[PDB]
Symmetry: D2
Subunit: 455 residues, 4 copies
């Protein structure tokens, strides 16, 4: 739409596209921060809406906002949560470090929309006001950090954790299924003492189980909300019950254990909870990287690699099956590693009463959660559930190795066993061929003595 609407702020009047619900400040920001293409994540936008919804309810309960105006704001916020206004938030991540502009973006959209809901119109003759009504009892300083934690906790609890548990379950099933399949162990990439495929997979299971607990330990700090601290953390210009009531409200509507932050100065001046929470995520990324690598190496081939297992072929060189799910997963693990550094730098850069590196920190944090959650889901349904052992190949490898010589010790002694190993190695023979060539035992004895199952 070419038609414009004249909106205004303390700085003056500016043209806003008539079909849009934002106002003067969002338009100004849009024109001053034309940097790259990253915008606020949808999850953050919804968290901001939830925060405004909660603030409105509590403001009403405290007699600070009229029932009609408060309910209108609440209704407008719900539409945002329903995905009806995703096109109303054009601001880039690369804006003011406190997230003031996106806060104002939400205030303007909710004000113009709530006005219409009250039979009013959008624009300068609106019934609901962005600052006086929608931003009542708040500050960009405590609102943005709150939206950050709401989005972070819900994403961890609703997306990440469920996917982690699911992948763990699948791997545990595979572990039990292949409990009796003996294969060659590998240390330093060299042939080593045997172990079952089930034991090897149990290692991946234990890794995921440990990662779960680590992630769980980081949740309580993220559950702490800054709302109520206002500009510098002192809570100036708020009702003494506000901070507690707004935290309770958010907890009730999200069904998540949110609590008001015991120290508002720590809450506004840092991104510590997220720096720590992300620490657990980079840990999971390192674990997932190793699991994904084991899978693709073990599945390498079909003729010139290891080929101990086969994975589902999901796309259209005969047996050439590229482990694409493993590639997507390893790539995103590197991404999480890089994201941790950006977050660490932002988190260590707070100054006095406020950390102004927030949009960047939340951009990286939510991205890591999306990548990890979707990555595990994709890897699970498109790879893990279909992992199958190549029994023939596994057995062939076992029988060609020199690592089973240990079973001969108790029968013919160490010296003779080592001699057989040496001969086989120097002459390129199997242990059986060497043992028989030397005449140290019969084939029947070899077959009875070297049972990999007793590793």
């Amino acid at each position: 739409m070419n038609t414009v609407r004249s909106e205004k702020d303390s700085m003056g009047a500016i043209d806003v596209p008539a079909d849009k619900l934002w106002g003067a400040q969002t338009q100004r920001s849009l024109e001053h921060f034309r940097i790259s293409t990253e915008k606020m994540p949808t999850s953050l936008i919804h968290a901001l809406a939830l925060t405004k919804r909660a603030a409105a309810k509590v403001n009403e309960d405290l007699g600070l906002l009229s029932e009609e105006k408060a309910s209108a704001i609440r209704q407008a916020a719900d539409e945002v949560l329903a995905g009806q206004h995703d096109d109303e938030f054009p601001l880039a991540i690369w804006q003011t470090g406190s997230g003031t502009q996106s806060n104002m973006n939400m205030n303007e959209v909710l004000a113009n929309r709530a006005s219409e809901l009250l039979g009013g119109v959008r624009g300068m003759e609106r019934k609901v006001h962005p600052n006086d009504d929608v931003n009542k009892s708040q500050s960009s300083n405590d609102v943005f950090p709150t939206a950050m934690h709401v989005a972070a906790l819900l994403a961890l609890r609703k997306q990440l954790i469920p996917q982690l548990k699911t992948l763990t379950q699948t791997l545990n099933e595979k572990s039990r299924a292949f409990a009796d399949i003996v294969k060659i162990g590998r240390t330093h990439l060299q042939d080593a003492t045997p172990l079952t495929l089930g034991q090897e997979i149990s290692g991946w299971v234990a890794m995921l189980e440990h990662n779960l607990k680590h992630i769980e330990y980081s949740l309580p700090h993220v559950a702490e909300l800054a709302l109520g601290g206002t500009a510098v953390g002192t809570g100036l210009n708020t009702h003494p019950e506000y901070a507690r009531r707004v935290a309770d409200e958010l907890a009730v509507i999200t069904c998540a254990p949110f609590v008001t932050a015991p120290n508002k100065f720590e809450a506004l001046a840092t991104c510590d909870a997220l720096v720590q929470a992300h620490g657990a995520l980079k840990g999971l990324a390192a674990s997932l990287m190793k699991i994904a690598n084991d899978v693709r190496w073990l599945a390498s081939g079909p003729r010139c690699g290891i080929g101990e297992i086969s994975i589902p072929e999901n796309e259209p060189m005969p047996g050439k099956v590229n482990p694409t799910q493993c590639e997507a997963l390893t790539m995103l693990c590197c991404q999480v590693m890089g994201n941790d550094v950006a977050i660490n730098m932002g988190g260590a850069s707070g100054n006095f009463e406020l950390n102004v590196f927030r949009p960047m920190v939340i951009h990286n944090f939510l991205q890591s959660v999306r990548l990890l959650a979707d990555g595990m889901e994709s890897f699970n349904k498109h790879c893990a559930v279909g992992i199958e052992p190549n029994r023939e190949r596994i057995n062939q490898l076992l029988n060609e190795s020199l690592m089973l010589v240990t079973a001969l010790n108790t029968h013919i002694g160490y010296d003779k066993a080592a001699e057989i190993a040496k001969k086989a190695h120097k002459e390129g023979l199997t242990l059986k061929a060497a043992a028989l060539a030397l005449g140290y035992l019969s084939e029947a004895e070899f077959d009875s003595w070297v049972r990999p199952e007793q590793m």
Copy 2:
């Protein structure tokens, strides 16, 4: 559009939305790699189109493709370059590590579209074929790395460098303008010996000038193209002149100094050129971070900070002017730092004949270029061009410091000068007040002797 079109590949038939130009493989990928929200950057999409356009021309020149089919492919590619098909590339960054899926995405879109251009129809009865025609003489293995370098070099040359030179020019002008303005120096954050504001800014200028040369030194390696190496770098299934001719073609149509990579194995097995090029970018990020910090600290106030300079107020607490442009810039500098780690991990992870961490590497690389280029442009036009000195404040600081005591040495000797400094410090007086209290000199003498201009 609900209506579907049945397309097919080696794996079978799959439904594709009728209004779309992609095919079976893109649809399969779309359904298997539902990970996060990051898709291929527009610049990479255009680079891929340029690569296909160049390959078509050379294939024609070598009599491998019919004039009509080749010109149709070329025309289809131009539409992509014109931005007519940005909606035809839905694939996520988190796909196969070689970028095979996006290569196929381009092949299918160009095939279906070129068919229509030849009076044909899109779909399985198309005149132009994705693999046989559009991907002729190519492999995803050498195509993707080529598209990566084309996008990288053009972005550096057309976006980044011009913006860097512009910011440098602005700062150089400011440096000359404030050449005579003496201010207090600061080391360890403590008051130190004086220097002019112009000298301080000249430091920022020299930093940017040095960064330019470093970036320029990284360009030749990025100019090397892998096209012609095919699957493993040997160039199997190509005309001996192909590699050279396709590099010349790209050079001609882009007006950039592209050359075929002297060693195709290094080109396919690594992302070394980008790892190194990004090294120069993280260097620029560190420099920009320091400049941005100096600006905001120097502009801090208006009453309780340093307040030596004032910056343009771009948005609507009276004199409270938040340095938002500085905040956006410092945030993106942290981003570039994190991106470098993701790139380093991906670059160090190649295996044998191919590095399969490419989509992730190019995602991070082009993002850093966008951030740095747009960031400098925004910071320049919305901050740097309007930097002004607060002469009154600057002079006040100079006169309140104890650092000008040095000018007294040649007149009254070191011992008396130090005594005046000590007295002023202990009693909270200015150097003049202390000197006069002691009776070591008259006010006229002080005013004549301590001339900061002779620092």
Copy 3:
């Protein structure tokens, strides 16, 4: 020299040394840089060998004579009597095999002497057959890593963290009544007390402590008993539990045998996670150190709200220039911890199959981080934090110089009118009161009674 040998043959070793052929050979093959195993790790490796000897004895696998001699040689290492006997670089085999053999040879040679024997090939105690009995480099090194890590965190890091917290808590309590100007985006903002600002630092440290404590249980898991690939092949069934118990006993730390030995051998997950908490602490400390040095900037042209002790001698003609040196040392080591995290992450993500072989590098970085953080907090505490003092005159001057207090006037006069005097003060360079009186909007008495900064 003395001639020692192994399967590869004989090699000369300095006669005045207790190491053997394998250590001598490694000394020639891994001449990389100058980093060696830190003392804490050497001690941890010695403790691991001491525990193994005791258990092997209890299980009747090792004679009392040899077992007691080995434990005795180990105690000497712990007592700092053999620091010069571990010359191997960090940059060796990724499993730490070299350092395992270094310990086996030193302990064997010394144990022989203790038994009236000699060092060298005629030694009575054998490095592989005796000192390394029931073990493998594969499960011994990871165990040593966890023992060193857990003891360093518990004995050094945690105590220093608590001490620094207590000091800052005392300061916040002491300055609870000093109102200062708040700063957001580096700009003048609304007031808060110095005590409140410091309480923010305290809460950060308290939060970090719990985060660090959450990572200890995983680090307490020991690999010992997993043997070569985690199966425990060639070990008595009770060995793993018994040795973990023994280690818990002699160190007084809650060590337990790892529930899953495959996870224990194939990864460095416990350390990747524990270090995550450490880089978090580094980010917190960096912020605290920066606030302190910026608040102390001056003495005339910065902020100067606080003063810190002058530790280094200064120029006679430059009184007042006090460089915040402890803050510079602390921020530098914080950057180091961040870098260390990346190295650990890359090593931790790089395991293959049954064993992660990036161990020496991971433990080198981890122990360094603990060392830097523990000592850094101690130094900052004693040489800076304990001496933080407010410059009350400067603080008040700044407070009464800002236009931020105009908010109090609103409650006593229309928003626009209160803002009106602020506009003038700002425009003319006057103070809120000066402008207020000049504009005749009020009198000195009523102004002072209305603008009560202590009332937030």
Copy 4:
């Protein structure tokens, strides 16, 4: 002990040491971890003092007697006669002031003795007045940093890089005729020669060399002469150029005075950029080391296309298990360089106004990276690369075992038909020829003549 003093008073220093009061005081205030200034930096700082002494003498600012004595004391440091005289930790003042004073005191005390004087307060040569004449810690430390960095890159890193490149170039030339199976995504792909694969490693190293060379000009710029804030106040106009010339002369390196002293003092930009090239080299080396160890994996259940020398003794009952130890040491240090880059970047991005005060940490990481890379390449070269040998039987077995060669058959039979035998070979577990003959699509003779792997 001996009693030395400074503006803060007197303090006892061990009589057998040459340092003074300021170094002794710092030793008590910065007791952080165990990292001290590396030898290369100590030498660089000594060279800087030697050059300053000469120029000051030439300008008539220092007496020939003292100037020559100072240079003599400096040469002794370079000769390794005073390594024990620099006990200061890396974690000190961010400007490196402590280490500057450490050098001033040691040089003053020793110079006095050289002049028939004594060490201590009755010394004839003064640390500040003489050794530090015309200088400041602010411009001396950055200069020492660049001298150490440029000399390390030129004398250690570059030569080792060229040597490793030459060795690998010989290998590619030697194995130019050995056809092996290519691998993409870890899957069997089309063939290439071992020589071609190795040529890829060579090209990587050659590219890295030029990238490293591009960073040298900026590192060659010296801050000396900038003085406290970069203005050069209190220095003779020709001092900066003369001292840079002197340094170029005695080191034989192309040092020049920094065109902009403000950029030189306020940042560590030259090192941030130079290190960028180093982490690039680390990424390249990591890839090379990984290829080598994976290609040598085995001896029976991996790839086993090549064999590398066995450097460490192995178990008698386990012949063939050759751990790629040099590859493990190399990949570990590559991870270290990556971590080091992050620490340097954070320090480099943290300068404020006229001076960057994260210097000791930046130089510690930078020099370590150079050391790790130079020594790592040397060790890998001599103990692994020179001995890389192909296992021709294994290579050929793998080549004739893959279905990838079916491409050659297409040119002699319809795509579908050629693919048909491939389908069977794959399905039945037969070889391309076995399936080809069993399907009767050709005879042994014509198959062998059609599938020429050497013809790519």
